[PDB]
């Protein structure tokens, strides 16, 4: 962290830690987790793919969730801390744009000026996201040096916070930056497992045997394993298709099985989950209901008790589905 | 109605009303309604667009559900229906093909053999909800006799129908068709309105002094409205921008009073609520969005509380309101 940092992510440092102490902070922060990123998700209980078996299978469901909803969560979280610390402006950057429309939803809503550094290049490709956070009242300064590009945004973000955390609160968007950004991400992030360990005590009255989820970045695993880390009776398989953060965590922990799932299993859980259960998954889910399937069939009668974390655009990527279909002639 | 339908629509109604007296119905009905509709919506107060004024505004945020979840709604109350009466099919039309695909979802998860009539013009410019009901595992049926549209492959339906209710059950998708139909489908859409009563009972202590809702088709104003129309000491302002089944149905309860909103004040309210709450609201919640506005500032000091129903295609029509925008040079 370059020296200059150091006063600013001091002061982040003993924020958090402070409001992690305020039970009057976690309240408003749910109350905003409840109204503004649709929390909690269902859970729900698959009985025709389990028929036959011993195995109890749950979804936790955040494909219905909106859009953004993730980034929307930690971004609640941070703008409220900002607030706290008596911050009057945000700074944030975004490619895509999902994530500066969720730093200026945020910052309307708690009332803090926002401004968003976004590169030329991506300003261009991006009308929609960019009218939005516009329409919000956010500022949209495009970057024109270097690449033109989120990494120009963002380090140009970076270049005015430094230079401005007295007043404006940084609004980081991955869990990769310097201390204790990694912390505060994980921690607004944490209530899918959290939620998850609620509901499945109250439905089933103990933990699950294994909680599947497909790790590799934006499918917010970390967020799903969280709160099993210390759940040590508790699995945690960690699905991989066919280094980044995700897995950086999820190795030092010590406590996740990597597993790898093929195309046509994914294509078969992905047939078979429409199939049985109505429900439409995105090939990230896929993977990791292919892997619970595979748990299931193999041993019919181990009483086991599992947990898939449902990924997200189910019927967003539900044409290269048809592709790879139309494509294999299965069509 | 057709004296062929007579004897399936009043053993419809018959299982209708048993089904009504069954906590353990309406227990099942709930649990599908929280796990694939993705219900309770939230309720959010809005504080910064009131701030100045006596006026507590509500927003039930039917807008953060996935598209057809209103939908959805009343398929998960009839598929479970069906099954009551120990149907095995389920027979359906669909024009865009979201009914057709909640039909399938709710047919696949209570095994039920599904089949959804559709207007062979619409198979065509239909692809993807046609290629989900059938990953669905129902069955497309495209009609091209006469227009090869929705009142085709409607009429082909109930022609299917009339000659197998015996054991399947006829998916009806608007509210407007023979009893005891309008009935079933109000019921299974007046969640709405009774979470709605419920929320604000919990956080104000009493009901809203008005309830403000965009009427016009498919903005499910009904569906909002039903648990009040009960509770007189509740306004019912049904708005109208610038017959319809919705307004029959209204203004026969006689307590439904209508206003007009203007194209201006619609884009006023929109413009407002995502530069003072965050929130994009689609053009229909506008303008009742709008009303509420007209309402607290005409008298800034009346103490009101007030609900608007938030519509939904926020993101979808967000086009068009650039549009608009541009056109008008605003932008």
Redesign the interface.
Known sequence: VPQILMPALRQLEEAFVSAQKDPEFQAQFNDLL???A?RPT?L?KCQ?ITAGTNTTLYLK?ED?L?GGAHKTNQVLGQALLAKRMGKTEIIAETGAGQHGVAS??????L?LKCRIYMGAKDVERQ??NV??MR???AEVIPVHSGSATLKDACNEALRDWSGSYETAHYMLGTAAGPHPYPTIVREFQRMIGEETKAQILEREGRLPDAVIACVGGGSNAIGMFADFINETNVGLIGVEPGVGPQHAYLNSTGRADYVSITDDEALEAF?TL???????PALESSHALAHALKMMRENPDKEQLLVVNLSGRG?KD??TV?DILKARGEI
Request: net charge positive.
């Open positions: 409840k109204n503004y649709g269902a729900t025709n469901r219905l909106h200026a939803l945020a910052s309307a809503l009332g009308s929609p009218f939005r329409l919000m009242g047939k429409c199939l049985h259960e109505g429900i439409i019927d539900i044409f048809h």
